[PDB]
Design a protein around this ligand. Structure first.
Ligand code: BMA
Ligand code: BMA
Ligand code: BMA
Lengths: 861, 861
């Protein structure tokens, strides 16, 4: 009979395992309370109003006890006679976080110890007709591991200390458990050591054959043909004939062809492979390089009892090559898609929430749409988080956002015992199997920063030199095996047509990590470490930059969402709670960078804005430099894209999906055709024309040197033929070739790139820190007009207006552009999209600019 | 038209590359001399009488200059107009040893740097009609590498020093080149740093499609069914239709089924898979566990231009599992074939000649037949040699000799550069692809002794502690990547159904190497190191013993083959050359073990015989112990099986295929049903019954304690039901439960295992070293009788006669048994096979026994 699958998302309740100190302290949690599946006991507590929202003000501490406690889930469910007559009946847990003991009708069913693994167990023996009682006990990873850890000769160098002191310093349990690293707190997120059934639970029943998977293995793909192999993986309880039918539909939906294969399956696993050749394929390309065409593979399996079953895969035909060849700059690192070398433009992706089980499809999609809108073509799913929901990868496929997929290791030195290795191997197999058919997934990576940490971080270096050399060898061997062998083999076996990368940053264990002439780099000498000036970005040029960034505050709307009017000061206890860099004392670093460029902010609202400008302009410099240095560099992924929480971070989009100034800048410096004018610390401005086109660009570029009084000092226009997929230097100007005798504090330069009379890109360059400039007081005129859905807002400034920031108080609105420069007498129109009426928008409109913000600023302390 | 292939095995000639010092010194080599291909310039020189046979007496040194020289090969070959019309014309080199520069008609063709790789190159442009000149220059690996090595901060720990001083001590070039390690000399072989085109060269021409391989991929195999996939690999120059037919024949030649697959191929590589399911397969079993049944898969390809091509594979269906499970003794290591745990019985296989290109098919077959006849089921092809000829593996398949296949790394610490790694990777891919379809190949192993050397050998320990810790990490990472990742992936990708083993001995990088409770072991505390007594074998019991051994001299006939009557003294200049252990003082180690048991040999012939008895009895102890210890141990592979040259070694069969006493003993202690009676150094004799049967054994076993005067002291017989695949201890007897009051120097014990009225196995036990025994003067009678081809020779001794050795001077004859014990009045018949006449065999017959040999012995020094 038809394979049946019933989800158990009803009647769940949860309570503290009896006998714990937390039970006495929180008696409401000692009693049964409603529970959501999927969910977390933390959010169950919040929903039952037992604890306040941990995101709000300084409530974070008030929920910490939950992650130190043991929890007991319970649900009852009924199984009908047809289901119990079936030859196979199983319970499936897609996600247990993390140390779980499951009982069914009072006897043992399952032991689970990996947040990222699927657990299938034969339940038929233990099930009864009518009412069944399913219980799931979850144990605090901290409470379970710490007693063991305290007796060990050493604790492995881990991640972050507990700000609440419930784990010893430098003795982190997080290292020893397969659980999302960021749960234990990070320098942009709260400590939420979640416990929960955080994925679906199912009762599944089948008779002759269970279809366990379909994988469209791409053997070779080019313009002329695609040769693939549909691989059906079939679990059979008894030997017998099956017949497989395969329909292939193209991007439009028409049948591409039909294929059939008879086979005899035997008890256990069986693979039935069907070869498919697609002439002149409509291939899948990343964003900006074509369409995101996808084919649909539909397999039908009829078993020995005449029962038919369907399984579908929506996949994209594409070749992927990680090209590493020797050249002038050492050894390249290029993502090549369909024979096209793609300069990776994007950012690092972290979880969308501190509580991942409640993340909506809406937010998953808008996060990717954000990336697409800022002209990105790649996101790196950073290894300190969790593997995303299926739907996330679906939208990624659809939008053409390539995914650099870390396995979920975030920097901690892993233990080298076999059991941890084999536990992790099975995790890798299941995730690779689940995600491999997504065309957007173009690279697997073993971890984030483990090697570079081992080699470059003070604590790692001291540790590895403190232990006996033979113990050091055991530890290093464990890492090399896990990240060099185990993960590589899983990918080579199950997702063979995409490359693997031992560690980010690194050279795939060829040599040392974080090199400038081989592999990728995480550059944090700006912001972190010595905290060098942002112009130092111009002196660093790796073959691929996979991390770098600057911090900023979220939107004013987001600030008011977690803070009250009395809290509006970066040094307030509430703002410090929401600043997680450098043990809560992050503002000092943030203020270092703000003051450098803009001096001392007049008020809290100016502080937030200036913090965002600091971040935006700093990253603008680096990204433009990287792109302009092609083919020396071939990748820019800034830290970070998104937030898990309302608070200060390196994101360009905050927790509520609100664009910072950086994200608006990102669209520009990631634009397919871009002009880069970068003035370094020697007073030299290098101008480059960047084109990601696969065709030549017949361009013109202008250069105008302006007094801040409106007078033009010089005007220049030149022709340029930019090659496809390239960067061309068109000029290099000293300060004195530009200003001559003119005062650098009172002069600026405008750079424009054109195609015919269409302005493709523009950059405004200054010759002194903004705080020293004599910026003009701008009179900005604004006109409104309905335009389709929302409104067209036209801004016109009489003078130069730097970094114009539009906002509307608590009236929600999106803009097609923001944080832009207005040039004298040149009107700019931006699309306002809002549920609000025009009159409301007009009344609520606020127009901020750099000159007005700096005006009246107090001195630096 | 049909693919054509012309082998270039004719007109080859070779000479010193002009401009070398050797050209002046060896002018005969400066001028052209005939060259055989395949071959080596060394054997070319010998054939041209430029140097004498290096195997004979002490001539080894006279050919050393060849390995320090550069050589120029040349051959002419004709190409007709028809071959030049072809769409593709390529030259293929199956074996270049090693650093090769190839030119064709004076133009650059190929650079090669790996003895074990196949080189295919597009030659069509460079060819002309009529005579073509192919030139191959080969460069001495020593001459090429040493100048570079001399400038490096360190030399990697390698292999053996040069006895001729043409490489600095502990600075070996051999580590840095992919070349058979034993070529550079070993402790059982001469230094023959061969240069040569040592495998075939072909000109191949084809049009539409070239068949590049056929692989019968075994997906799952059991009693009920075998599911396989014939994988046809096709290189195409242009897109077009192909047609594939597959015929499958069962073990006698029956049609089991026929299959077809049409496809369109595209430029480059193409995969055509045909699924095949064989109901109730006749599976391949190793020797002693069933038949060696094989199926023949015959594939035919017809392309788009009407060209038909055929490829055949002879393969055996078998499941293979390396089972490692936790038990009382740690973690097991057992080879499981078709669900049957096989106790591995065998030895380590090394190259069959110092010049591998001249090895005959006959010698390949007799070596494996040697193994089969001595009741072995596995040979380990040791990593210091070379991957064998195809024919060797065919015979292995046929005879049921499992092959433990080392990759050809012999112990040296490899360099960690990418270039060496990728060169080695392609080597691994080609060798695995070449050998994977042989059912006898049941395990791949990364190397011999690299890890255990690094951890336990004094020089390695000092070296690794001598470099900066970061440099140590680089070297270790290179090893772990090469042996843990690269080889593993190659095996997992191309030969998925057989296990991989990082290093021998080791725990597959799970932990340290050479453990007693995990993985396999090379035990050399006996013979090597402290040179402990052979009874220490009874105190060492690893989960798998993959190396152990004792040295001995070859047959007297073989000795006379390399030495003259004046050379017959272990300390003579010739015999020292032929002793390669411990540089020049190997004789001291050998005499230590001989003197321990037998005192001082009276003459050279007694020395050879006693050296062989020492070896045979010593290995008997260990091998019997290991088998009797099941399931603690599950493997016995003694070092070594064979020789590369006439001389002293740890072999049981010498260079001319002549059995030592050890091989005759091997047949007995590897027998499927065996009785082990082992007396330890504490005066305790443990008796065990060993059965490799897959069915119960209803046995009786006897024990008799005898005076050397012939009187019986006691007689005992017991019933026993021995379980399948097991060992059963049936007794443990003190010296005093056996002898009571009797003098241990004048009494012995006989242990026998019977099934019904058939004697399966016997062991004779003594209670004191042989030199201290009062063995009786044996009068041994001999009777001859014709039977078909050879003769039946019946031996009858009036008293106990120990270790009787039959020989016939220089008259060649083989024996069905030798080196046996004769019991008083009990006749033994051995079959003599010889071309000789009866009268001459009778005249030439020499019969030696232990007592007569010890009689007249001089005192020890
Ligand atoms: O190592 C410093 C940076 O490294 C990244 O991988 C992230 O962990 C960031 O949150 C962090 O600021
Ligand atoms: O090949 C890598 C390098 O190391 C050794 O092999 C030497 O032969 C060098 O000539 C070579 O350049
Ligand atoms: O190292 C001692 C032994 O190790 C083995 O691997 C072989 O190389 C033997 O020739 C040698 O006697």
């Amino acid at each position: 009979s038809h394979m049946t699958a019933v989800t158990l998302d009803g009647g769940w309740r949860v309570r503290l395992v009896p006998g714990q100190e937390q039970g006495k302290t929180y008696p409401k949690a000692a009693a049964w309370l409603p529970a959501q599946v999927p969910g977390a006991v933390q959010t169950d507590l919040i929903a039952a109003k037992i604890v306040p929202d941990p995101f709000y003000r300084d409530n974070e501490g008030k929920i910490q006890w939950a992650g130190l406690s043991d929890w007991q889930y319970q649900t009852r469910f009924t199984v009908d006679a047809a289901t119990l007559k079936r030859e196979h009946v199983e319970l499936v847990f897609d996600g247990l976080d993390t140390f779980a003991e499951v009982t069914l009708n009072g006897k043992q069913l399952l032991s689970a110890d990996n947040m990222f693994r699927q657990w299938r167990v034969d339940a038929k023996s233990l099930l009864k007709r009518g009412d069944n009682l399913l219980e799931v006990k979850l144990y605090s990873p901290i409470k379970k591991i710490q007693p063991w850890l305290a007796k060990q000769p050493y604790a492995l160098p881990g991640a972050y200390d507990s700000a609440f002191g419930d784990e010893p310093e430098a003795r982190h349990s997080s290292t020893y458990v397969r659980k999302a690293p960021y749960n234990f707190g990070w320098d942009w997120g709260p400590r939420m050591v979640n416990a929960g059934i955080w994925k679906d639970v199912r009762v599944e029943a089948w008779d002759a054959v269970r279809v366990d998977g379909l994988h469209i293995a791409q053997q070779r793909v080019d313009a002329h043909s695609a040769q693939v192999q549909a691989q059906l993986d079939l679990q059979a309880g008894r030997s017998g004939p099956v017949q497989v039918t395969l329909d292939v539909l193209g991007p439009d939906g028409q049948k591409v062809g039909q294929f059939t294969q008879d086979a005899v399956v035997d008890p256990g696993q069986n693979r039935v492979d069907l070869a498919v050749r697609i002439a002149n394929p409509k291939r899948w390309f990343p964003a900006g390089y074509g369409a995101q065409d996808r084919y649909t593979f539909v397999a039908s399996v009829r078993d020995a009892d005449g029962d038919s079953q369907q399984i579908k895969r929506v996949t994209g035909l594409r070749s992927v090559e990680l090209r590493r060849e020797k050249d002038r700059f050492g050894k390249s690192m290029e993502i090549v898609i369909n024979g096209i070398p793609i300069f990776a433009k994007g950012a690092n992706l972290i979880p969308l929430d501190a509580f991942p089980a409640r993340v909506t499809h809406e937010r998953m999609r808008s996060t990717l749409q954000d990336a697409r809108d800022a002209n990105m073509n790649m996101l790196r799913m950073w290894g300190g988080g969790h593997y995303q929901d299926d739907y996330f990868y679906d939208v990624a496929d659809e939008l053409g956002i390539m995914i650099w997929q870390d396995f979920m290791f975030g920097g901690a030195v892993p233990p080298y015992d076999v059991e941890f290795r084999e536990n992790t191997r099975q995790e890798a197999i299941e995730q690779v199997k689940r995600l491999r058919d997504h065309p957007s997934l173009v690279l697997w990576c073993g971890n984030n920063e483990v090697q570079t940490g081992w080699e470059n971080w003070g604590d790692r270096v001291k540790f590895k030199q403190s232990v006996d050399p033979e113990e050091r060898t055991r530890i290093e061997r464990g890492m090399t095996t896990l990240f060099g062998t185990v993960f590589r083999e899983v990918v080579a076996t199950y997702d063979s047509d995409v490359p693997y990368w031992a560690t980010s940053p690194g050279t795939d264990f060829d040599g040392a990590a974080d090199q400038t002439n081989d592999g990728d780099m995480h550059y944090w000498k700006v912001w972190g470490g010595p905290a060098l000036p942002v112009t130092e970005y111009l002196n660093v040029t790796p073959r691929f930059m996979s991390e770098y960034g600057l911090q900023s505050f979220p939107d004013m709307r987001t600030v008011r969402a977690f803070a009250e009017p009395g809290d509006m000061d970066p040094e307030s206890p509430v703002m410090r709670v929401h600043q997680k860099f450098d043990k809560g004392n992050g503002n000092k670093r943030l203020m270092l960078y703000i003051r450098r460029e803009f001096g001392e902010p007049k008020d809290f609202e100016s502080f937030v804005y200036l913090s965002q400008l600091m971040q935006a302009e700093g990253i603008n410099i680096a990204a433009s430099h990287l792109r302009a240095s092609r083919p020396q560099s071939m990748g820019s992924l800034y830290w970070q894209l998104n937030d898990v929480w309302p608070g200060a971070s390196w994101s360009s989009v905050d927790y509520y999906g609100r664009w910072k100034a950086l994200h608006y800048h990102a669209r520009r410096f990631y634009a397919p055709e871009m002009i880069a004018a970068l003035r370094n610390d020697k007073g030299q401005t290098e101008v480059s024309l960047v084109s990601d086109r696969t065709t030549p660009l017949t361009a013109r570029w202008r250069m105008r040197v302006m007094g801040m009084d409106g007078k033009v000092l010089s005007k220049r226009e030149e022709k340029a033929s930019v090659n496809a997929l390239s960067s061309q230097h068109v000029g290099n100007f000293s300060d004195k070739q530009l200003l001559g005798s003119a005062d650098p504090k009172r002069t600026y330069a405008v750079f424009e790139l054109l195609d015919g009379d269409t302005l493709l890109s523009r950059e405004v360059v200054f010759f002194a820190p903004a705080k020293q400039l004599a910026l003009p007081a701008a009179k900005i005129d604004s006109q409104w007009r309905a335009d389709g859905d929302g409104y067209a807002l036209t801004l016109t400034s009489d003078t130069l207006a730097r970094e114009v920031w539009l906002s509307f108080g608590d009236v929600d609105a999106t803009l097609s552009d923001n944080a832009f420069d207005l040039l004298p007498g040149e009107p700019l129109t931006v699309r306002v999209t809002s549920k609000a009426a025009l009159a409301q928008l007009q009344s609520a409109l606020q127009v901020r600019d750099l000159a007005a913000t700096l005006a009246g600023a107090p001195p630096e302390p």
